[PDB]
Amino acid sequence: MFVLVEMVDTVRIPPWQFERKLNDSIAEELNKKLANKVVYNVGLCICLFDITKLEDAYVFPGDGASHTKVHFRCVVFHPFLDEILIGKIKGCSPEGVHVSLGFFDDILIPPESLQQPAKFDEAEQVWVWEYETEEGAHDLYMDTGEEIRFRVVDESFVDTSPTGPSSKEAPYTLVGSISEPGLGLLSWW
Amino acid sequence: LKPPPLFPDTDYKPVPLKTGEGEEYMLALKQELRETMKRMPYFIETPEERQDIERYSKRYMKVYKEEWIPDWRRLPREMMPR
Amino acid sequence: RSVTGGAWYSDQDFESEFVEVLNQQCFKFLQSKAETARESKQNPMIQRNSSFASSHEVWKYICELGISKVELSMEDIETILNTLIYDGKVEMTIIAAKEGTVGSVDGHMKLYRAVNPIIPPTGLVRAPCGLCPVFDDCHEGGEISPSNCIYMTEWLEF
Amino acid sequence: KEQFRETDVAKKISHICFGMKSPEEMRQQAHIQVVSKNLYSQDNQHAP
Amino acid sequence: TQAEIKLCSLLLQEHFGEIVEKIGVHLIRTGSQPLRVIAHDTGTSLDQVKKALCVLVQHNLVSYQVHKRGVVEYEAQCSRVLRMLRYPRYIYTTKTLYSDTGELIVEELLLNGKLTMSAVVKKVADRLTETMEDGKTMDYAEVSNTFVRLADTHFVQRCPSVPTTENSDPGPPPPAPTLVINEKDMYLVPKLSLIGKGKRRRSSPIPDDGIYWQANLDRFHQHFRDQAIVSAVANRMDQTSSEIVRTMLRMSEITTSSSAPFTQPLSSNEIFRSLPVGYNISKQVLDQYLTLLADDPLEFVGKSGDSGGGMYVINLHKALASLATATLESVVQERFGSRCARIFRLVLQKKHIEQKQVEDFAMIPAKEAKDMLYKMLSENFMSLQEIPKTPDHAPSRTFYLYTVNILSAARMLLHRCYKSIANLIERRQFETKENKRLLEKSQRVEAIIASMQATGAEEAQLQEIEEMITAPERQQLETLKRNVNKLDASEIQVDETIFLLESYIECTMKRQ
Ligand code: SF4
């Protein structure tokens, strides 16, 4: 699921920094600026991988800082479709089961993905399972459970940019699949 | 004070359309025509781009077609598609 | 041109309803006579001669049925007939005052007898855009953006 | 966790391109259509 | 010409696609220029520009010309991009004049743009195989017969050909092959004898090499002009008279030029011998019809001589002036009522008049005409000429004499129609793209239902598939479809107008 992407940016180093060697300061500043945030075309950023090249460090008039342009590589969470994944549950819903990878949580298993036999619960939100001969419609999925196996089947970016003159859902969502044998709770197999 | 609404009403109205078997055939022919423009080389779409991964399915579903060439004696010798 | 206005100026309106209904009556009656001519297709020379609806005879047809009790003799009738001769209800067949009854009086047969609408309506008129009072405006992305022309919206509905 | 956005949009002028405004754009820029000749409300509040 | 440029963009998008639209619009915007600057301006890969130009010249959309300093210039004509709208009409009248084989010939010819006889007849036969079944077959013989008949009757006209290399400019070739057009063989079909039974989609060297062909657009325009004239005549007097005028047009066409104001001389004797045997008409009856037609006060036809007893010549320029005038009356009447057309025509026939005369002579009440003339004047359908009373041309010292400039009038309607078709096209595209989600949702399940039907799968899918939300939306899909159909019918009728409006602005101009 992890992917590596190349980037470029301009970094301002405020003047009391000048003691420490530059490369370290730019690395810190980029991690500060970009870490733990999501880009509209490449997903969720983890941290920078390395810095490839550095231009000259100008000083613009009217300011003490030094501006530098940077070429750098950053590792980003961007799972592609049909990847097999293991992840804890985080909550049931009528429209599906929410799953969590710990650092990320916007995974939904819709009921169409669930196995045919089980369609709804006894009015309790904890999703139940059913099966033909054994498992007489009594297994159910705990809201955390184990790291169930599932395979991604859909994804989307949704924009959240401001609209109109100035003066909560995450911009990324995934859909998983559970139907195929060997998936779900490990105890089943 | 209030300016008029963006659509002021008009007393006259557009005259009823003429219809008939010939006109129906014109309409159907126009539709059929629209369909034809989507199934020959002259319908230049953007060349396919941006594969995600080395999906094993790539072996089978790949679209196969001969390279379109016009007869070259009618055109300048400058724009060969190779 | 005061109280006179042509004696049709009764009610100080040109008596619009009466002038228009009188013109419609003349038109329909001369249609009837030209229709006798057309139904007979009389030896075409005489077909068009009978399609010369004699407007002295029209003048005598319009004094009666109680229509033109008001001033009628030539002048006032001739001029209202002429009000009908200023459009596509008519076309030149007067041949001066000497051929026909005083030129069939201003040519009140001329081509009332027919001149069928040279051509039918026009797609332009039979379409919203062309009929839209507010033209111009309607710009790709704007208030009257053609993507809402209620005229169309309606023409679409109907 | 929210969509990243750049914080500094600062820039520098490089050219002035003079030109003309046609009716469509002139309407598109404007907010309202002034239609009344008068300056203030009849009441003593004198609100425009 | 901006509306027109919008039409070009729309029809390039609809026929060919984005990149082709982009190149075509930029070229029709900038004029004849060499390739390198086009590639620079567009900024795309020269491969795309090259491929698009090859496709465009294949359909004869664009044209390339050798130029000074050895560079090659590429150019397009705006008129040519305004023709595919007429292709339905072309196919209809050809199906009217020829069986479905001629229809297929013409369809293939226009869709390909240029093709030779052998391959077109082969492709027509192949595409006809699915039009007859139960062991029925066909040979290239009948298709060749229809093709040669079409070519003889001038609907089919030969494309240009190269000059011979070993005859002219031996050695390295020039930048462009500089094709030349030959007129004597324009209707001369080459010869073949091959015949082949078409393959019925069972899924299990050229004698006419280089002899390409393309439909004769001018013949179709002339033929349409003839049909319009006949239709005017049929409505004018009678079906018999139009059958007569359809006659004088027949012997006129084979020898008359399309551009002259007047046809070649015709005699009633040759009209009569050409007159159908199925009509019970005598020579004297024809002579009477011709004399009274020539006596028509709209001067549809004139005498112009006495050769052969009956001698008559149709007046093209004057008629089209009448054709156009009438449609001007038409647009006025509906959009402004009969009384308004009553005044407009009055002002036309009275070359110079004033309002008080109009009210007196148009039976219009005061305070009802004045505003209406102002409306016509505001709309520029009426042009004020304004002779003065004094040289300062002060409004207090002038007469408001009205005047009509028919040629200018037509031009704005052309502009109107251009915007009109543009706005229809956009709305249809807008409707298509908004409903595309439900369209594809329906199409996938229709494909699922149509799939594996012959494989013998169980019938427990017709109702099960239908259980979804699409079913109570089919009536909305039908509403969509009729809206599209109904927009298209509107487009169609507008083209029929365009033909007459364009026919006049062409005929009224001398192009000197
Ligand atoms: S407002 Fe709409 S209907 Fe009127 S002219 Fe403009 S596009 Fe056509």
Tab-separated table of C-alpha atoms and ligand atoms in Angstrom, chain C residues 128-129 132 134-136 138 144 146 149 152, chain E residues 423, ligand 1:
chain	number	residue	atom	x	y	z
C	128	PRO	CA	-37.329	29.442	-28.693
C	129	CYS	CA	-33.890	31.066	-29.166
C	132	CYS	CA	-36.313	35.020	-27.164
C	134	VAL	CA	-33.758	38.893	-24.405
C	135	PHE	CA	-31.225	37.756	-27.051
C	136	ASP	CA	-27.489	38.445	-26.637
C	138	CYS	CA	-27.554	34.253	-22.794
C	144	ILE	CA	-29.376	33.862	-18.571
C	146	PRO	CA	-28.552	29.133	-22.227
C	149	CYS	CA	-33.568	29.689	-20.988
C	152	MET	CA	-36.484	26.552	-23.887
E	423	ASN	CA	-27.692	26.346	-27.786
F	1	SF4	S1	-31.994	34.154	-23.992
F	1	SF4	FE1	-32.012	31.952	-24.585
F	1	SF4	S2	-33.735	31.797	-26.066
F	1	SF4	FE2	-33.253	34.011	-25.879
F	1	SF4	S3	-31.764	34.409	-27.557
F	1	SF4	FE3	-30.529	33.941	-25.716
F	1	SF4	S4	-30.156	31.694	-25.855
F	1	SF4	FE4	-31.852	32.148	-27.293
